[model samples]
Target: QLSICNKLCYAVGGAPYQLTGCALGFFLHIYLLDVAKVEPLPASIILFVGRAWDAFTDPLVGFCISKSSWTRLGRLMPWIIFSTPLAIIAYFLIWFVPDFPSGTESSHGFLWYLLFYCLFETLVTCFHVPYSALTMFISTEQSERDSATAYRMTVEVLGTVIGTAIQGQIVGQAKAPCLQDQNGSVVVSEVANRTQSTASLKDTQNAYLLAAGIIASIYVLCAFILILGVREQRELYESQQAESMPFFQGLRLVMGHGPYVKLIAGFLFTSLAFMLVEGNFALFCTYTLDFRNEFQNLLLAIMLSATFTIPIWQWFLTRFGKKTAVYIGISSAVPFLILVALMERNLIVTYVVAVAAGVSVAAAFLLPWSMLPDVIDDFHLKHPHSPGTEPIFFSFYVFFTKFASGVSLGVSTLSLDFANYQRQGCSQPEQVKFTLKMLVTMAPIILILLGLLLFKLYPIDEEKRRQNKKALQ
Candidate 1:
């Protein structure tokens, strides 16, 4: 907070993770299915296993970092700097398509991606856990760190925008030539078909590498900025028993706590709902809505809307309670999602859906983080000086949600295979198209309602929250 330059670079340092994650979250499934030419089931496995591995590493990485000793480069910065190159390399390989001999039944492309995806997950976890924890060391005062975090969150949103634009534009353009055969035709089913995808596939493969290079460059640059600009200051140890709770028992207590469970339980469903929509919306826009060219722009609209609307949601949560904001901000997207599914193909309407959905995305992004502190405060009040529980709260929340995301994507994507999804093809069967629609629409609506039902049971209203705040004081 003392130096704008330090804080700005610190905040900007957070963007690369968002950039890598945003692009991959939205684009990866479809890319694996279409460009990597992996079958839906196999592609689903890559996604599922990768995400599960990422979640599994969240706490493991955190605990390891807690054990690490400070060195000249600092306890956190060395992790960030060391992880970048490997992370970048693994990231590129995740996008890379291995050429296999046509004679073999399988190219082992699935294995190629699965290994690299999990590798990338591990390396990114190394970077992310340390980076997030570095926040604590960046400033002496908690209030100062909070402002720094605000800056971090906002620029991370901008990074989301950047990832969307760069990947979407390059990939969308590359996909154009492959979308149609020599004669223009609409495929309601197998009726309209195009054979031979050699050239198109090559262009797309190269395009993904191009995107990887650009995104990786950003990662390296941001890591550099964070390293050079922000000096990590050692914290003054508060003279207390720092090791109040053992790791495994602390995990139990955090998970077993009423409000934390309820908060994440409600959010798990809601987050999974949104995650489903995000993971599949690309395919939905491309195949179901028949807006191939516009899919990128639609993605851009959602991310941009989410980015811009975060301020409004921040204001809304402050004006109303976080609970009220949860009700309205998240449920707000349902109607638009329904419209996206029910309506006929219209560019204007689809874009409108994107914008509205993005607003809800903003709410989803902000509210949990806002509410989490209250839960943590309540925990500290109840237990009275529990040590190292914050990281448990932080990591496990990410763990559960990400684990659910993996499952949601895995099962949902696997269903496409059952629906006889056409791998490596431009057009899909009607059932495949319908499945994509459901993944984004009905599926999410059901999950959202279920999530809200848990919210209905959520105990933290304004009165309780206010009481907790007073007690902490």
Candidate 2:
């Protein structure tokens, strides 16, 4: 089993990562389209373009790292340390929109946003590729890995709380009733409804700056803890590096493995479904449920529920095999999803669904991750000649993960645009609300069903795992 310190180190690093994830997944689109008044198409394009860059760079970064031997701070640590600052800078830039001239086109905002966003994604890949590969190296035991995964996910939820819940409060507080004066100066005033208030563009900008600063600071702090606390087995890494394979050949070989392919496909579908709900969570809460000022509470409720349910899912993982646990988790969420779609502004029912979603999605959060190392180990047994291919494998793994996010964002954005969603004003039409409800609820169930189908074809089982291990021995 891994030491407590090791678990804590790994888990702590997730806080900042999740913090950034919360911002991007929930707030970034809204911030650009609503706060900055950029058009929906430009904002969507920015997200898609950045992720496209990620798709290209993820594998390249992994391949380059796999080929090098930086024994100074171990292969992973050096990358983590070097990339931390760059990631922080890029993250900050993502939230920092300067005071540009009045009537700036969407293209202008899109270009700068794309530049900063691409840099952020690339820097994150530099760290993420190595960090993920290190999971296998850190612990060989399944239970230990499960424990680490649980810890990491639980902490990630806490980060989500801060980024969405706490940051939402900050933004809410910064909001003020104001209008543009004759001279273009913002004039604060009283209003009958806070929800109807325009809240000067300057207020939105300052709120973003403040929230970004806080989140960025946390990212830097978490990076330091991760670097200092997590230890890599350098000798083991060096020995494994001796059995290298050509990147493309190894990638092709790994792809040939049926179980791995099915597993990735399953994860891709599930991730797309999960991110679809996540990316539109705030919008769902604000627009559909009419929790305009209190939308963050919905995110808080889901995150808090998910955090509390981690142990239960951990138990499921231990009692049943990974596949079984996943089946249970994904299936459990379906009924609740339908309930959410039909609730139609019932806050009580929606809150209950939110908690249930967190509980059900616990498997989505934990199982695939717990199952990944097993798949990697099985692949290693099948291809004993390929020693140092883990990094490359992880790169492709990360690639699909980002690709899933991009697909979800693209679909969600286009759906909203088609539904005629309004970003300039807080008010959403019936069509927009109807579309958001379908996207957040029905779409998730359909995707989950797709994942369930893929899992049925996955070849791995307990006996197969044992046989693979036996072959390696």
Candidate 3:
């Protein structure tokens, strides 16, 4: 039986990944554009490359985990433990802005971000693949593992709440260079006089580094808890060493499943929708919506409501059914999308929109992930020959969504560059503002609709799920 502490420890182990993910999703793009002040072009490359690289690394790490035998700490735990410190180091360095005398962004700056962020992402893949896969080994009981999954989903969403608040509130206190005059025109300081703007930039720099360090500390602490509390147990009746399928062959057949493809297809767009909204939100709120001071609060509202309302999803999914939940839960935000983007500046309306979309996002996270186990069970019953098909589907589901975000981000950044967005401008050009609006509104709305369509097209339902459950028994 998994105790409170066992479930809690495994759950906390999932948090660092979500924490870092939430922080980066909310802040990193804007951080690179404004704080790091990398050229929009270089920023584009760094983000696009880093994201694409991270997506690929998922399957690669999945392959790595499959070949392993039990070590002193078991196959999965060591990956999570050993990679964490190095990941934290790489994560910190990714936030650190180097001294570039010649310009705001340099070849070296690009090199630094590319190297460290990619390194940090790869390290994160190591931690996440093993950690998530620990679900299978955490407990063999159908009921017990389900509890851990629920606990993990709760903490992961809750981690987003904490992560957003910690980074958003702490770093949000720093002042922006977008100083507006009484008439609302930019009150440009010495722009880049170095001497004049240096202090403000320096303060902002420390704010991010401080925020990252605190988050990193949480990673180490949670990792410690996970190491102490959880033990991996394979079923005693099963053979001690079964051949987990070879990686490429495993992936080949994993994709061969009908329902898995439909699920990934639905999610790729949905995750893209969420990522487009999230990844560009800081810039959109700061520049497009002209709510510079309130964007952090906006992010907090999104995260907070998402976390608190998860139980609403649990209850709703149970009572209303997952497919029915998907129809309303994801589509619920469509009106808010237009309101927040197309409408004029109104803080109150935006807050309502944030909370509304937050609930929808909670649905997005829970249903797709929990629905996943059904696919795996369905696949195994269909194909008894396959062993260890889990990693391929689990990791690749992550891969496609991450890949979708990469493409969305690449589009956003590249569009901003084409619109001539500036790192230090007190006001963005009209083109840049419109670009932000499109990313936040039109792009995401389109993705969401397509996602909904795919979800409608999805083959699984309570009936199918129950059948799989009964058969597996």
Candidate 4:
């Protein structure tokens, strides 16, 4: 029972780190763009630039993880143990801000933000990359991998739900009691009753820190549970037994291999679509849908659908074949994508459409995740060299997921700017209309269609995956 509890909590605790990362993106982009007065383009540039910097570091960490054989900490457990705390600290730093007399302070930006953003992104690489690569370390069987993916992603969706839905409450709780939202513009209503010191700005920052505190505490405890619950077993394919292949050589070989590249590309493209939508979801709630500060339930609803639907999709994968099951869900993204493109607007209707989009994205989220391990098994069958090949592959897979998110953030930033989105917190109806329309219609349609086409080339049918498993054995 303790083991089960540990496993469950350990799995769920990961959400805080992920939630903080995501929640920061939801508001920070706007904060930088509007509050700090960084133009949308520059903000996007700064964010993606940091992420791009991270691309190089991610694999090095992975290589380290895959290559190491630790005695005291075990192979994968050290990362969870050490990095989770650092990651939580870094998360707080990302949201924490010292008082700046002026709203637009770049010196502080250079001094504090530069350090915070870099540390946050780096620590995320430290903790999450290895943690994410946990999927590779957990089990080698396709079904087991599927279960791990289901558990991992279910927790992920839960994190998103808690983060997205409850974030308003978190912020609201931390907000000054007399504050009000006047058409998306936040104002301190009780200012007449208080001093106007710069320190007051800390309240705004505290909204984030409060959430971070809760999230970080949960994260550390979860990391501990994970360490206790999980056993680090032998790697599926040992590097000693495999052919003498350098890390880069193997990476090159994987990318050069036709099936793997197609899978990566498909996954990357689809992930970009998801992140773009995710990055914009809260903004859409406030600006596009006019749900203001009150519509967080919409986000909650989307995440809730993912939570319930993912398992159903998992069950479907066994009966219908993973690829076949993915078809209906992934395709559902097209209509709403088209709707947004055509500039449709109605909160109630949009909510209904978002449900369909949620289900589609939920399936998309599950399949590639579960499929990657099957591919790794397939590779082992064909080559049969290397210890820890699965972890190594997992390391690379996470690299792409992180890389894709970084790129998507950049894309979403520029897209908002191009569409004339003002960071003023309160947007004109025209501005909201344009942004919402694009989010709902053109951008999603194109992204979903592209993702759908790419998914067609994936090689992980039941027969093929089973064949690959046997071959590896």
lDDT of each: 0.71, 0.73, 0.74, 0.65
Candidate 4's residue-wise lDDT over 155-249, tens digit each? 88777666655567776532333333554445534334453455765566666667768767776666676666666665444356344666566
Q: Which ten residues in a row have the lowest lDDT in candidate 1?
A: 173-182
lDDT against true structure, model 3:
0.74
- lDDT per residue (tens digit) for residues 2-92 in model 1: 7888788888887877778878887877787666666788776766676667877898877666545557767667888788877887888
Residue pairs in clash, model 1: none
- Give residue 2's error in model 4 in angstroms: 14
What is the lDDT for 220 in model 2? 90
What TM-score does prediction 1 earn?
A: 0.76
C-alpha lDDT (0 to 100) for residue 306 of candidate 2: 83
lDDT of 2 by residue, 365-453 (tens): 77777777767666766555465567876788878887887778778878889977766554568898788888888878888997898
Q: Write the per-residue lDDT of candidate 3 for residues 397-441, one digit (tens) a residue.
A: 778867886777677768888877877557667688787788788
TM-scores, each model vs. reference: 0.76, 0.81, 0.80, 0.79
Highest TM-score scorer? 2
Query: Which residue pairs in candidate 2 collide?
Result: none
**Candidate 3, run of 10 with poorest lDDT:** 234-243
The window of 10 residues in a row where model 4 has the poorest summed lDDT is 172-181
Off by over 4 Å in 4: 1-10, 27-49, 70-73, 88-113, 164-167, 173-195, 198-211, 235-243, 281-295, 336-348, 419-436, 458-462, 468-473
